[PDB]
Design a protein around this ligand. Structure first.
Ligand code: CHL
Ligand code: CHL
Ligand code: CHL
Ligand code: CHL
Ligand code: CHL
Ligand code: CHL
Ligand code: CLA
Ligand code: CLA
Ligand SMILES: CC1=C[C@H](O)CC(C)(C)[C@H]1/C=C/C(C)=C/C=C/C(C)=C/C=C/C=C(C)/C=C/C=C(\C)CCC1=C(C)C[C@H](O)CC1(C)C
Ligand SMILES: CC1=C[C@H](O)CC(C)(C)[C@H]1/C=C/C(C)=C/C=C/C(C)=C/C=C/C=C(C)/C=C/C=C(\C)CCC1=C(C)C[C@H](O)CC1(C)C
Lengths: 201, 158, 225, 202
């Protein structure tokens, strides 16, 4: 069987708990899943390569002294911008991000006409043609690849929700919590931290 | 599959020319075709204007920096007056060329490489070359004066 | 050189997708009316050209009001005295007037915007454009019509005109135009009466709203009685 | 639509992409919630401009034991709210009058209790159009457009009240105080700098 975990994909079946009234939700959760996938991975990798929590990473790059993020990346012996130049600038990064992500979102969602000329209908979260340089979808199964991605989508969104509530409970960070739970499983869990009071009680 | 680059002129292998990446490259062709001499539909006077400006502007520089008075404070003024004198000589050369060169009928026409029949360049005529010479004179003197101005004005000139 | 004449098939870097009208069906519930849609409430309609004159003064006064606003916010210099900075003499100062400017118009030392240099560029650029806009010079863009304040070809690279409702956008611009012109008139009268910049007058009026008004300064005679 | 350009839409204008419109009672609930929110955000706006007390702390000033503090709180008042000598707006006094007046109005708004007026005023209609609109602004104005204006103000003010409650929970400083801090220096005074400080808990 395909998708036998719990419930069924939006493409086929009905939610056990929700009515699934609106068909905008399907692609919404695809996009949300993909973003979460990149977010969870980011939180996984940053705290490994740098040791900082993902939720306090924002404090390193601020409109004054954004140079803290420079050279934080593993390997990458050259910093983001040279030391002493002070060019890692929150506003410069923010403007570059605003223009790039805003243009990408406008192209995806039809706020602006697509720059390309080859199909790419607005609102489809599986474009394929331009977004498969390797040609893995035509070689593989399209439907089961889409199901795998969905499983990853929902798994990563649930992992992100876990990351934020772990951040709120323990105030430490995802990987450090994972390592504490691995080291002493009985003595590092949610009920253990509840016995400590979650840091406020 | 075993591409050969160098080809005869317009595919005719019996004319004294060969089309190479130096002659028929798109970038070279676009650069040369956009130069004023090859703008045959434009009035010869204005093509001569730009020509004179460009030529009189640069030609001053050798006299400024290598002339007899290059060491003196009047190096620039000497070099620009030398450039103006050379512009006048070249105007004389242009006038005599225009008087003498275009004396024949040239019954044969001209076509583009695509085979489109086109009219002859008005520059390639006695009166057209006279207008081009006048444009050359005005442009050359304006360019020499501009070179003087820039040597007296430009911040990083030395 | 051969004739290629291939197909460019280029699309705009940004091309606004159809967004239609973002305004109510009623378009001028404000005092007066847009030209070509009713009778002028007070002043007589001088000429067909006056509509386009209103548009041009409007766009210019928009740009002037925003310039005075941003100049006073970024430097504190009033707009009516910003002219004294760049002069045939000592136009070096005018350079570093933009907050956050990575570099100065005038690099440290002699390197500098000269008044005459700036001026000569200003004439050669602005006059050219002014002429090309009007019947002077010629039309370098035949696809557009000289004497039309809304050409809407290359002059709307984002294509907001065609993306939305054109005429509601037009009246929106007209209302912004009239608002900014009246605000500009207020700015010049404030400069005359108080000798302080627009944002300075704003700040004085918002810090203590009850005082620092027309009539408060009139009690002192606008510094003339 | 042409008129409604906001992200979502008004009930009857169409259908919302998320949580589409169900029962009409939901639309009645939205309008009434908006109306009370407009009143609430305006009160939280005006009160601490008048006297400086955040709305989430203004409750405790009146208590069953002592309610003198609420008297003479309104700026510009010619006299005390009740005698200066012995203010008598006691919390119980306030309650006993207010529960009766508000309960009456509510039951008479919804018609669970027989209407006093019986002027044709039909309960369960957000726009009574009777004595409630003496100016009859709706009669002169365009009623569809005006309904859209009312709903836009409803949603804006309900969102503003959500902002007020969450700002109270994060910064516990006060709405206009948060405004003044942000206008003072928005770059270094906003939600994310308070997050860097930790919202007062972390
Ligand atoms: C939508 C994407 C995104 C999300 C979810 C976050 C989320 C966060 N950022 Mg980041 N950021 C994001 C994008 C960006 N941040 C920054 C720059 C910063 C700075 C400068 C700061 C943060 C901070 C924070 C944290 C607290 C702020 C907050 O709203 O929580 C509120 C809490 C909720 C539960 C939301 C409901 C939180 C983990 C702050 C921080 O680290 O505080 C500890 C901080 O100071 N972020 C930039 C600019 C480059 C971004 C660009 O998109
Ligand atoms: C040859 C150069 C070089 C080498 C050996 C490494 C080596 C490594 N990098 Mg680094 N990196 C290098 C260049 C760069 N890295 C990064 C950005 C990153 C990221 C984003 C990540 C790594 C990660 C890793 C690990 C896999 C490993 C420690 C990954 C890791 O697991 O971090 C611990 C990871 O997620 N590197 C950039 C972009 C600025 C580089 C540019 O030169
Ligand atoms: C299934 C129903 C059930 C519920 C609602 C609770 C609820 C609770 N247990 Mg109990 N337990 C339950 C079943 C069981 N518990 C235990 C054994 C324990 C232990 C050993 C501990 C708790 C603790 C707690 C508290 C903290 C959990 C938390 O972080 O939630 C917070 C969740 C929310 C706020 C929203 C969702 C909470 C009051 C912990 C504690 O310290 O209490 C103070 C603790 O240490 N529980 C066993 C094993 C026999 C159970 C078997 O079903
Ligand atoms: C690249 C870095 C850089 C940064 C961070 C800033 C930052 C700023 N500039 Mg500056 N500028 C920068 C480079 C430049 N500026 C200017 C010319 C201007 C102008 C003309 C204006 C600004 C304005 C502003 C502000 C606008 C805030 C928003 O919106 C802000 C203080 C605006 C301002 O002063 O607002 C009051 C404004 O009007 N800047 C030039 C020359 C083209 C720059 C070139 O590097
Ligand atoms: C629409 C009605 C209404 C609402 C929403 C509020 C809301 C509030 N009152 Mg007010 N009051 C209201 C009516 C009245 N209050 C008072 C008198 C008081 C007193 C005496 C006190 C409050 C307090 C509070 C706060 C309670 C916060 C809380 O429980 O934790 C948070 C709850 C949630 C987030 C809900 C989920 C909050 C700001 C208390 C306070 O904050 O004191 C500082 C308090 O002591 N109110 C009277 C009678 C005169 C009312 C009559 O209707
Ligand atoms: C001579 C009488 C008188 C005067 C000049 C004022 C003047 C003022 N009152 Mg006060 N009030 C007066 C009597 C009274 N007020 C109030 C109750 C209020 C309220 C409820 C409010 C004011 C507000 C205001 C301010 C309006 C500013 C804006 O608009 C201003 C300080 C408003 C305010 O705080 O604005 C800042 C406001 O919301 N006054 C009552 C009823 C108890 C009064 C009875 O006579
Ligand atoms: C109590 C207030 C309230 C009520 C009853 C409604 C009800 C309605 N709205 Mg309105 N709306 C509100 C607030 C409200 N809205 C606010 C604040 C906004 C601005 C963000 C909007 C914006 C809005 C748009 C843009 C649209 C609607 C639409 C609708 C209809 C869709 C069905 C629906 O969602 O109902 C259920 C009611 C809800 C309020 C949804 C629940 C929301 C969840 C619980 C999140 C809220 C979190 C909560 C505030 C947490 C507080 C915690 C704090 C106490 C500590 C319905 C008539 C749609 C419509 O009519 O389409 C035709 C539509 O397009 N509304
Ligand atoms: C110079 C700018 C300018 C121009 C060219 C126009 C031109 C026009 N307007 Mg616009 N308008 C302007 C300013 C201007 N208006 C401003 C600032 C406002 C806001 C107050 C408006 C508000 C407005 C409305 C509401 C309406 C128009 C209308 C019209 C049209 C009819 C009026 C006409 O032809 O006579 C133009 C004649 C004049 C401009 C002369 C008036 C001169 C007075 C005395 C003002 C002088 C300003 C100042 C005190 C000078 C200071 C000098 C300094 C040395 C101190 C026409 C297209 C109407 C329309 O389109 O009809 C269908 C219409 O309904 N306009
Ligand atoms: C990497 C990085 C580094 C920096 O340090 C900081 C930083 C923040 C920038 C960060 C960047 C992160 C990014 C970009 C994240 C993007 C995240 C996104 C899009 C998250 C979405 C999260 C979604 C959730 C919770 C869903 C909850 C919904 C649930 C359970 C309902 C489930 C449900 C339904 C639907 C149907 C069933 O039948 C029944 C049940 C009831 C089970
Ligand atoms: C004034 C005063 C002064 C004293 O000092 C203290 C004091 C406490 C007594 C105080 C008294 C104030 C009072 C009485 C206030 C009354 C407030 C009220 C009625 C608030 C209602 C608040 C309502 C909210 C948040 C709604 C949230 C709903 C949201 C986002 C969903 C939005 C949603 C929907 C529906 C469908 C779309 O498709 C899209 C999305 C998904 C966005």
């Amino acid at each position: 069987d395909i998708y036998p975990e719990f419930g069924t994909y939006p493409g086929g079946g009905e939610s056990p708990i929700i009515p699934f009234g609106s068909e905008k939700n399907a692609e919404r959760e695809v996009i949300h899943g993909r973003w979460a996938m990149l977010g969870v991975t980011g939180a996984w990798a940053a705290e490994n390569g740098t040791g900082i929590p993902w939720f306090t990473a924002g404090t390193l790059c601020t409109p004054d002294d954004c140079t803290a993020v420079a050279d934080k990346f593993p390997g990458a012996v050259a910093p983001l911008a040279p030391e002493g130049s002070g060019y890692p600038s929150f506003w410069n990064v923010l403007i570059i991000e605003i223009v790039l992500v805003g243009a990408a979102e406008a192209y995806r969602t039809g706020i602006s006409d697509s720059p390309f000329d080859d199909g790419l209908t607005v609102g489809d979260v599986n474009p394929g043609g331009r977004f498969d340089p390797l040609g893995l979808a035509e070689s593989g199964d399209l439907e089961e690849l889409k199901i795998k991605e969905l499983k990853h989508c929902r798994l990563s969104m649930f992992a992100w929700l876990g990351c934020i509530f772990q951040a709120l409970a323990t105030q430490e960070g995802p990987i450090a919590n994972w390592q504490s739970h691995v080291a002493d499983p009985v003595h590092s869990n949610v009920l253990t931290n509840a016995a400590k009071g979650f840091g406020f009680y | 599959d075993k591409v050969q680059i160098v080809k005869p002129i317009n595919g005719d292998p019996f004319i004294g020319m060969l089309e190479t990446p130096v002659t028929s490259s798109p970038d070279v062709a676009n650069f040369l075709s956009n130069l004023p001499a090859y703008r045959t539909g434009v009035a010869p006077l204005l093509r001569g204007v730009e020509v004179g400006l460009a030529h009189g502007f640069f030609v001053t520089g050798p006299f400024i920096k290598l002339g007899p008075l290059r060491s003196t404070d009047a190096a620039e003024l000497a070099g620009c007056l030398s450039g103006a004198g050379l512009v006048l000589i070249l105007t004389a050369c242009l006038s005599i060329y225009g008087a003498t060169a275009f004396q024949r009928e040239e019954v044969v026409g001209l076509k583009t490489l695509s085979g489109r029949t086109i009219a002859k360049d008005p520059l390639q005529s006695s009166e057209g070359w006279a207008s081009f010479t006048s444009g050359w004179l005005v442009g050359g003197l304006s360019g020499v004066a501009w070179s003087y101005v820039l040597t007296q004005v430009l911040p990083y000139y030395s | 050189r051969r004739t290629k004449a291939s197909v460019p098939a280029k699309r705009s870097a940004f091309k606004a997708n159809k967004f239609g009208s973002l305004a109510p069906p009623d378009l001028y519930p404000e005092f007066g009316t847009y030209p070509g849609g009713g009778e002028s409430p007070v002043i007589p309609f001088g000429s067909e050209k006056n509509a386009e004159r209103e548009i041009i003064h409007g766009r210019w006064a928009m740009l002037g009001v925003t310039g005075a606003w941003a100049a006073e916010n970024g430097t504190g210099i009033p707009w009516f005295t910003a002219g004294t900075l760049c002069t045939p003499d000592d136009c070096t100062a005018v350079a570093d007037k933009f907050p956050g400017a990575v570099a100065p118009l005038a690099p440290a030392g002699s390197g500098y915007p000269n008044f005459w240099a700036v001026l000569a560029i200003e004439i050669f650029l602005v006059g050219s454009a002014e002429c090309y806009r009007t019947g002077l010079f010629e039309n370098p863009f035949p696809e557009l019509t000289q004497g039309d304040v809304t050409p809407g070809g290359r002059f709307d690279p984002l294509g907001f005109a065609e993306a939305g409702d054109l005429e509601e956008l037009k009246i929106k611009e007209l209302k912004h135009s009239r608002l900014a012109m009246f605000a500009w008139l207020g700015c010049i009268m404030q400069a005359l009466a108080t000798q302080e910049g627009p944002i300075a007058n704003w700040t004085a009026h918002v810090a203590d709203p009850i005082h620092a008004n027309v009539l408060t300064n009139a009690a002192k005679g606008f510094k003339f009685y």
